[PDB]
């Protein structure tokens, strides 16, 4: 650990000033008023995960009931209902092309669903096994490549046609709750109950960097739109922004009013607005530069598990344990 | 301004809503149980009439009432994250090692862990002390005294009366952790059972109607 202490001095030597000082002289975000333009119903139990499609017109929502449903946002119409072998789920992912959806649960398997088939049903093309514990996040790099996060302290990349791990990321000392994919897809990050977020190169199979600034477990992680920074969500009731090139925490988002844990995070396309979902049943929008809470979006009676901003940037969809998922614009 | 395609989509969408409603209504008839035992528990042993690495399920029906029991082999010792899913369960059965004494302090700490969790407050606990006949044989031999393991148990006032007093003492030890919260929404029910009991499903069944009875009293403003 002597090199780590030298590393601790090395990071301090690299950074001249904190982000907060530089951020001070910019025009304020101002009061933003976002009212829910839609509410989506038909989920009869707690919703753990949602993912926005690339089109921004489709999303998939996983729930305690054991029915994974795909619905259309604007009309609010419902496109599919997928029966699940396991009732217990924590993850859902939407493929970039949109043909594939993945489901992961306490069964320790990530089930990948091809939406298009003869007979017009959703079928599982592959069930992926090799994780000793639950999968906490899944994300598609590509139509044939998926990276999974799990409570084994391991993250795994699979070839769906081959059906076994082509690479294993096993640098973590704790259960890895969340995983975020970069815009370039060649690097990704993952966060865990060890309270450390690590930068993973997809091709190498190695951890390039490790960043820790969190008191508690990180439940959620999101990459900045540029792809050079990311934000994390923790039970510490704090959201911290780290930068890849600088390798240091730029800023932390915290307030006295909120002691409850973060459960989700996402960025607007600007990156000015880091949307966050809390255990207090309220979702707060923060000026990213100044760490000042612009406004609060409070339409949920129970905790918000998942929050996502569309790829086009129009809307924020919040799914909660209240059992219906509300779009916000 | 709504096309035949949008209306025909609305057809299969509303059928999806109806099918989800029917599936949910089918699910609500079932009552869900989560069985946690640290070790030496007899989790398989509790119900033998009826009997996937991550989660292992045993399901039994009594009086045409269906019970779903979930036990996890895959998960590690620490259970913080996966417990959050099972906050809709009817009850959580904690089976504990009656026989050995050295386990009992850690077992009580585990009881406090399951009881005091923020997400699992509303749920109650149904407690079976397995292998109590094996405990009675050892205590009748009298070589090892559980009163030595705890100074309060060293002086205690309540099958032989002494073995019965020790058995009631450990039972009260498990109840002692549960009473402290005092909210009253959640109450633990101690029960005693040897290794081979013809039906502990009867005890699970009467405890379940008691819990549902109390929740209904709370719902109807009777209490």
């Amino acid at each position: 650990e002597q090199l780590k202490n030298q590393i601790r001095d090395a990071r301090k030597a690299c950074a001249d000033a904190t982000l907060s000082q530089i951020t001070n002289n910019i025009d304020p975000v101002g009061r933003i008023q976002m009212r829910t333009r839609r509410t989506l119903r038909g989920h009869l139990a707690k919703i753990y995960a949602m993912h926005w499609g690339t089109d921004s017109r489709l999303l998939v929502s996983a729930s305690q009931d054991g029915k994974l449903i795909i619905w259309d946002s604007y009309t609010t119409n419902k496109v599919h209902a997928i029966p699940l072998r396991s009732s217990w789920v924590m993850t859902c992912a939407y493929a970039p092309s949109g043909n594939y959806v993945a489901c992961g649960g306490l069964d320790n398997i990530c089930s990948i669903y091809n939406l298009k088939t003869r007979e017009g049903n959703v079928r599982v093309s592959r069930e992926l096994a090799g994780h000793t514990g639950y999968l906490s996040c899944c994300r598609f790099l590509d139509d044939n490549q998926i990276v999974t996060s799990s409570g084994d302290t391991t993250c795994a990349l699979w070839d769906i046609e081959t059906g076994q791990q082509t690479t294993t990321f096993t640098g973590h000392t704790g259960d890895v709750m969340s995983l975020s994919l970069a815009p370039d897809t060649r690097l990704f990050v993952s966060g865990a109950c060890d309270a450390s977020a690590k930068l993973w190169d997809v091709r190498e199979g190695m951890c390039r960097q490790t960043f820790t600034g969190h008191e508690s477990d990180i439940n959620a992680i999101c990459f900045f739109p540029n792809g050079n920074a990311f934000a994390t969500g923790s039970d510490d009731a704090t959201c911290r922004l780290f930068d890849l090139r600088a390798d240091q925490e730029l800023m932390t988002y915290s307030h006295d009013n909120i002691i409850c844990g973060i459960t989700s995070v996402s960025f607007s396309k600007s990156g000015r607005l880091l949307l966050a979902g809390y255990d207090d049943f309220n979702c707060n929008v923060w000026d990213a530069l100044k760490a000042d809470r612009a406004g609060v979006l409070a339409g949920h009676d129970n905790r918000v598990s998942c929050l996502g901003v569309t790829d086009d940037g129009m809307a924020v969809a919040t799914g909660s344990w209240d059992s219906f998922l509300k779009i916000w614009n | 301004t709504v096309s035949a395609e949008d209306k025909a989509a609305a057809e299969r969408s509303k059928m999806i809503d109806k099918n989800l409603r029917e599936d949910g209504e089918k699910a609500r008839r079932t009552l869900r149980l989560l069985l946690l035992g640290a070790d030496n528990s007899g989790k398989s042993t509790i119900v033998k009439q009826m009997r996937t690495s991550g989660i292992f399920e045993t399901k039994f029906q009594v009086d045409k009432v269906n019970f779903h029991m979930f036990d996890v082999g895959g998960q590690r010792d620490e259970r913080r994250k996966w417990i959050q899913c099972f906050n809709d369960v009817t009850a959580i059965i904690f089976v504990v090692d009656s026989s050995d004494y050295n386990r009992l302090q850690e077992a009580l700490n585990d009881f406090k862990s399951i009881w005091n969790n923020r997400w699992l407050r509303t749920i109650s606990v149904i407690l079976f002390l397995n292998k109590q006949d094996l405990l009675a044989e050892k205590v009748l031999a009298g070589k090892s005294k559980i009163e030595d393991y705890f100074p309060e148990f060293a002086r205690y006032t309540t099958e032989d009366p002494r073995v019965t007093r020790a058995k009631y003492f450990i039972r009260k030890e498990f109840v002692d952790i549960s009473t402290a919260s005092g909210d009253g929404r959640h109450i633990c029910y101690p029960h005693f059972t040897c290794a081979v009991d013809t039906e502990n499903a009867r005890r699970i069944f009467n405890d379940c109607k008691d819990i549902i009875l109390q929740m209904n009293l709370r719902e109807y403003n009777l209490v």
Partner: single-chain antibody, 216 residues
Framework: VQLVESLSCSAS????????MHVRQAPEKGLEWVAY????????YYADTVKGRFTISRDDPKNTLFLQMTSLRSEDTAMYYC??????????????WGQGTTLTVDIVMTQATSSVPVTPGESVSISCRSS???????????LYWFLQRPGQSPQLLIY???NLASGVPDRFSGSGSGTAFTLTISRLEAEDVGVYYC?????????FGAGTKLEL
């Protein structure tokens, strides 16, 4: 996924209750509409000509689309094949057709040239205008095309003039302006030959055209 007929139309190779089901080919001319039933008997629609003298029935164990006939007339006689669909965002309607049988006893869509001479390797266009503006308040254009090879029931090729059905060679393509539309074919080959029919699905009846033909 095979549809057999005896009208009775027995379906083997898919989940029967998940699909909608629906066509009459005149011996003299092209396709013209009969009737539509949704999945699990949601709704029924008819054109006035064949209306009131036919019935649709579904039975899940028998897995069959049914036609019971009244008022039999020289219009009734026809060759019909069972047609089906699935509707959601990402719709691929009119995907697969039945084998066919023979029995012996609103918007107008047509394309100008009934017969088109074909030269290999040269791009050509088949245009059929629509009476009612295909473009809809969402922005989804409901213009469709088919190909019936002789002796084989037709298949889907292009829907909406911006989307192309899978299972189709990519050479066929589309371009469109509001309520006036022009199709693009390229690199025509053997098995391209046949009669192409186009359709409009803003509101029933299913206005099917007599179509145009590729002639070698």
């Amino acid at each position: 996924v095979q549809l057999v007929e005896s009208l009775s139309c027995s379906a083997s190779g898919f989940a029967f209750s998940s699909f909608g089901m629906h066509v009459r080919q005149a011996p003299e001319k092209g396709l013209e509409w009969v009737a539509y039933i949704s999945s699990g008997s949601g709704t029924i629609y008819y054109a006035d000509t064949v209306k009131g003298r036919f019935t649709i029935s579904r039975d899940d164990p028998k897995n069959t689309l049914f036609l019971q006939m009244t008022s039999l007339r020289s219009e009734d006689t026809a060759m019909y094949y069972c047609v089906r669909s699935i509707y959601y965002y990402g719709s691929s309607p009119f995907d697969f057709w039945g084998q066919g049988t023979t029995l012996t006893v609103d918007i107008v869509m047509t394309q100008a040239t009934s017969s088109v001479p074909v030269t290999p390797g040269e791009s050509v266009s088949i245009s059929c205008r629509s009476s009612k503006s295909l473009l809809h308040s969402n922005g989804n254009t409901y213009l469709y095309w088919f190909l019936q090879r002789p002796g084989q029931s037709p298949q889907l090729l292009i829907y909406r003039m911006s989307n192309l059905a899978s299972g189709v060679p990519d050479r066929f393509s589309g371009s469109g302006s509001g309520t006036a539309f022009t199709l693009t074919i390229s690199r025509l080959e053997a098995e391209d030959v046949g009669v192409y029919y186009c359709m409009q699905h803003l509101e029933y009846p299913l206005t099917f055209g007599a179509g145009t033909k590729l002639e070698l």
